[PDB]
Amino acid sequence: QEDHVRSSFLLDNQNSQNTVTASAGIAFLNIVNFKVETDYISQTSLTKDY
Amino acid sequence: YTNCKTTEDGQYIIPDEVYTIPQKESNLEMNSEVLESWMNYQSTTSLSIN
């Protein structure tokens, strides 16, 4: 009797997360007040098996 | 079947004009193959402006 068993397992995984927050405020002396804030979140994940 | 001839192991009746060589051979071959692939992708973008 002969018996061979071969088991290969490959796992891959990537997570990528970017965050940006840009704020800007011009605040005069109670005449003009202009405030701007932008936000940007990019979250990805990729898992592969075999 | 005049002589009621029998194989030596006593398993079968054979005609008088034949003879049996006992070659009790067995061959087994089992091949199993499993392939499994798993790809998981996940994305999430989020933009905020004020």
Numbering used by the authors:
A (entry chain C): 217 to 266
B (entry chain D): 67 to 116
Provide the authors' original text about this structure:
It forms a membrane‐bound pre‐pore complex that converts to a pore‐forming structure upon acidification; but its mechanism of conformational transition has been debated. PFN2 belongs to the membrane attack complex‐perforin (MACPF) family and shares structural homology with bacterial cholesterol‐dependent cytolysins (CDCs; Gilbert et al, 2013).
The flat ring pore structure was resolved at an overall resolution ~ 3.0 Å with C2 symmetry, and with local resolutions ranging from 2.7 to 4.7 Å. 3D variability analysis reveals that the top of the MACPF domain remains largely rigid in organization, presumably due to its large inter‐subunit buried surface area, while the bottom of the β‐barrel varies between circular and elliptical forms. Compared with pre‐pore assemblies, several regions became unresolved, including the epidermal growth factor (EGF)‐like domain bridging the MACPF and P2 domains, and two β‐strands and an α‐helix in the very end of the CTT (residues S600 – I642, yellow in the pre‐pore). A loop between the P2 domain and CTT, which lies along the MACPF domain in pre‐pore oligomers, shifts to interact with its neighboring subunit (residues T581‐L590, red arrow). The β‐barrel is further stabilized by a molecule of the detergent Cymal‐6, aligned with a strand from the P2 β‐hairpin and whose aliphatic region is packed with a series of hydrophobic residues from the back of the TMH barrel in the MACPF domain.
